[PDB]
């Protein structure tokens, strides 16, 4: 790929990176770099869009009961679910 400096650089992309950003800025928790960071976080993988509030509450209840951060990967988050998440 094309570089932007006088010296060519070698970069390694380990782990799993799929190049998608957080839907809303309100999730940011680290000022430096504007990043969202969690340790020992649950992941909810949904093949279909998550819109209805009835479909999202139980996962949040489980996460709160176990007191662990939650990451939601899906097609998209609708206005209702996004509003609930940001409010919480």
């Amino acid at each position: 790929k094309d570089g932007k400096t006088l010296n060519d650089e070698l970069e390694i992309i380990e782990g799993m990176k799929f190049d998608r950003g957080y839907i809303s800025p309100y999730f940011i928790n680290t000022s430096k770099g504007q990043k969202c960071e969690f340790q020992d976080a649950y992941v909810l993988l949904s093949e279909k869009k998550i819109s209805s509030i009835q479909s999202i509450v139980p996962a949040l209840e489980i996460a709160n009961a176990h007191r662990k951060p939650l990451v939601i990967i899906a097609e998209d988050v609708d206005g209702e679910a996004l509003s609930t998440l940001v409010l919480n």
Binding site: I53, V57, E61, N64, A65, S83, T84, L87, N88
Partner: protein, 100 residues
């Protein structure tokens, strides 16, 4: 009949107060203030005099003040008493009554 806050329903109309909308689930999650929609639990505060719909003598209302009832989700009329909302239904539209 029974009046309430200087108000008195006519014929067989019944005045009820809706219950508070749920904002915190059984867990530690709050719900949006626009997602509660409408509640179907209400409390009777006033009762009309009698029913015009019965032939000959008019009949009394079948519910009494203080009870808990399950309102229908489509009917009703909105009335304002001292800026507090109140809803007016007919006797035949009250879906059911709770017991203790």
């Amino acid at each position: 009949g029974q009046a309430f806050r200087k108000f008195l329903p006519l014929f067989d109309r019944v005045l009820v107060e809706r219950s508070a909308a749920e904002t915190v689930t059984k867990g530690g999650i709050m719900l949006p203030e626009k997602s509660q929609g409408k509640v179907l639990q209400a409390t009777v505060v006033a009762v009309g005099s009698g029913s015009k719909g019965k032939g000959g003598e008019i009949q009394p209302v079948s519910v009494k003040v203080g009870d808990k009832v399950l309102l229908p989700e489509y009917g009703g009329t909105k009335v304002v008493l001292d800026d507090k909302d109140y809803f007016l239904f007919r006797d035949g539209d009250i879906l059911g009554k709770y017991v203790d």
